[PDB]
Scaffold this active site. Structure first.
Site, short mmCIF file in Angstrom:
data_model
loop_
_atom_site.label_atom_id
_atom_site.label_comp_id
_atom_site.label_asym_id
_atom_site.label_seq_id
_atom_site.Cartn_x
_atom_site.Cartn_y
_atom_site.Cartn_z
N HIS A 112 6.29 9.26 -4.67
CA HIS A 112 5.82 9.04 -3.29
C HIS A 112 5.67 7.77 -3.24
O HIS A 112 5.98 7.10 -2.60
CB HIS A 112 4.09 8.46 -4.55
CG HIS A 112 3.85 7.12 -5.03
ND1 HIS A 112 3.80 8.25 -6.84
CD2 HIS A 112 4.06 6.63 -5.47
CE1 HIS A 112 3.45 7.17 -7.23
NE2 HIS A 112 3.80 6.02 -6.50
N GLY A 118 4.10 -1.90 -8.52
CA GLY A 118 5.27 -1.59 -9.07
C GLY A 118 5.80 -1.43 -9.72
O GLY A 118 7.00 -1.15 -10.30
N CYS A 166 5.03 2.15 -11.31
CA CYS A 166 5.42 3.36 -10.94
C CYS A 166 6.75 3.70 -11.51
O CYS A 166 7.98 2.72 -11.43
CB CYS A 166 4.91 4.12 -9.27
SG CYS A 166 3.28 3.99 -9.91
#
Ligand SMILES: *CC(=O)N1CCN(Cc2cccc3ccccc23)CC1
Ligand SMILES: *CC(=O)N1CCN(Cc2cccc3ccccc23)CC1
EC number: 3.4.19.12
Lengths: 306, 306
Positions: free
Chosen positions: B41, B143, B145
């Protein structure tokens, strides 16, 4: 979201750990520049610990009696000296992995990370607080002495603790990196008593602010209170008294949540008198005091390091 | 002595974290050999997340649309592919700090360390368990991830988790390093429900053995019980059923303490029915299930790593 007891990343410290051997004893040492730091009781036998005269024992040691090992690389000791309760071993090779570092003596209630090591090798990392009685509640077995506690600010490692001993009561005592013990303890095998272990009130408040930031709001009540009225209740439950400096330090958390410090104090007061009634806060059934206000801001805002 | 929720030392993983930017989104990536791994993503905008067609979005990206940064060193992407829910970015430079590593898909109840990162930089490390409903209760902000979970065995880093999303309920979901989600979750902004979160019984028993090793023996009672009788009580309190494999895994802890597993089970049964009566075990007022039997043996025996 979420809240965890978070340690600092340990990589910068891992590259500084070495194994120190003198006679039969093997401990951990901390290799910075061309100096190795380690507990002076590395020079003791099991018999010496009851009543050691360190100056006399150290006389019977020469530079070639100390074996320092970093993995498989071997350091040559070219100078040794005792500074308070740590030995400073001068070696021939400067550590290429020496980080930007500083030695700092922390105050009770401050938190730091411990890198538990055995034989110069890292075993694990955890966060803990210096208790108001200058002990820490760590996890240490035989051979872990010389393991260090530290903080990271920006790119600089601040070393604040070196592990020296377990008290007969199961708690841990150690020195700063200049070798001064925290608390009244001595590096000798004798009965030593730590004082009363009180709860770090300013840390509990910081953690209640963390809980509100993360959605646990049930403990928030209608009342308010005064600093004097709160401290009168806190001291009955062996909580440290709150001062205006503590109120000032909590200011940014107050601003972010819209909850005044004294209002938060009134919630805590009711939690101390009525308990928690089988409920939890941030997954705990006890009031938690191992997060400083700075730890909360750091975790809830995502501060990073080198 | 002492017992702490201990994470693995993180240095070997710190040298693998990079920052990945595609368009406007910036996440963490994991740089091993000449491949960077990151959540797919990263190619999405805020609008795409409601219903993303990743294959179609990925078509509109070329090798030069991905900016990978390691501190200040810059990697050139020379090949990209999607494997399930992770992107594999082939770069021109192999990571010189690549450790001995392995990709592993863990089972619920296993524990691992998380290195929380932002912008490719480490923020902190903590230990957690994979819940029986395939979520984890972490600490993650926007942030984070692409931050990874891992174990260390000997000298080998076993990567088992990459963080992808926060559920509307505040718990965390992610994939293995082949990009298969743990649990039934999908990387899309839609209401997703995790199942019932049960307690990991075998871990609770391991932690009771830890407590006995460290001197908390009050919960040890006269009774005993049977596996069937225990499981009947456990399931009423949403505890995972205990199997013979679980009894086998606890064998070494039984041998070291002289307390049979079923006897320990009978203590737990009474703790579930009568509560703890305001007492604590290893400093906790709740039964703790984030230590595996191996974590206990590791900590109580001082196992070290590279
Ligand atoms: C931490 C560690 O590796 N050790 C601690 C115990 N021991 C030596 C030692 C040091 C200070 C005080 C003290 C008191 C009683 C017994 C031993 C002591 C070596 C290993
Ligand atoms: C972890 C992190 O850095 N982020 C998580 C949220 N977001 C994108 C994203 C990914 C998966 C699911 C999802 C659902 C709703 C909203 C956003 C989502 C980017 C930053």
């Amino acid at each position: 979201s979420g809240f965890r007891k978070m340690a600092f990343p340990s990589g910068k410290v891992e590259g500084c750990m070495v194994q120190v051997t003198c006679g039969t004893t093997t401990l951990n040492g901390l290799w910075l520049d061309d100096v190795v730091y380690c507990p002076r009781h590395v020079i003791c036998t099991s018999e010496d610990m009851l009543n050691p005269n360190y100056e006399d024992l150290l006389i019977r040691k020469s530079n070639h009696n100390f074996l320092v090992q970093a993995g498989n690389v071997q350091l040559r000791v070219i100078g040794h000296s005792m500074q308070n309760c740590v030995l400073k071993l001068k070696v021939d090779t400067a550590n290429p992995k020496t980080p930007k570092y500083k030695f700092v003596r922390i105050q009770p209630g401050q938190t730091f990370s411990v890198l538990a090591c055995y034989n110069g090798s890292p075993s694990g990392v955890y966060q803990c607080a210096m208790r108001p009685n200058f002990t820490i509640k760590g996890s240490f077995l035989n051979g872990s002495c010389g393991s260090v506690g530290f903080n990271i600010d920006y790119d600089c490692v601040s070393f604040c603790y070196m592990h020296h001993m377990e008290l007969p009561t199961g708690v841990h005592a150690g020195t700063d990196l200049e070798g001064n013990f925290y608390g009244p303890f001595v590096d000798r095998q004798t009965a030593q008593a730590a004082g009363t272990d009180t709860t770090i009130t300013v840390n509990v408040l910081a953690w209640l602010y963390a809980a509100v930031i993360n959605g646990d709001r049930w403990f928030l009540n209608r009342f308010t209170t005064t600093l004097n009225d709160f401290n009168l209740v806190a001291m009955k439950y062996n909580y440290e008294p709150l001062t205006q400096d503590h109120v000032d330090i909590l200011g940014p958390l107050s601003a972010q949540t819209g909850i005044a410090v004294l209002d938060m104090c009134a919630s805590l007061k009711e939690l101390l008198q009525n308990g928690m009634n089988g409920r939890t806060i941030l997954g705990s059934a006890l009031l938690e005091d191992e997060f400083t206000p700075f730890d909360v801001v750091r975790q809830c805002s995502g501060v990073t390091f080198q």
